[PDB]
Amino acid sequence: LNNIFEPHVAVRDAAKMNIPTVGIVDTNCNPCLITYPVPGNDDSPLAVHLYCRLFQTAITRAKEKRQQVEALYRLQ
RNA sequence: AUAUACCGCCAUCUUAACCCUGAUGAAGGCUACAAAGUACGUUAGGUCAAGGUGUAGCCC
């Protein structure tokens, strides 16, 4: 949601451009166009910090996994 | 004599594209503590005094 409590225009724009979307959807949000909605609290700093930590860890681990798989493939 | 011959000079008057919204209607698109917007003619004009080119008049 944007600062007038309406959906972020980027949701509809990404749907138009066929870009998958992951999203934290609170009880007052619209999850219809988010490809992978995640119901949860988006206001408390603890929840937002947890979301950031989880996503950062997942992305970093995925990139490291790709690099080590490529290294193993090159070695073998 | 003629600018009521022309110039020279003064003066008069006329006169692109793109992207979104509306159910893809005419149509619309902004908020910064940001909410779709970005890329010349005219005149029986004057002036031959600090300028010129012609044209006609008269020649017991």
Ligand SMILES: [Mg+2]
């Ligand atoms: Mg909320």
Ligand SMILES: [Mg+2]
């Ligand atoms: Mg005159």
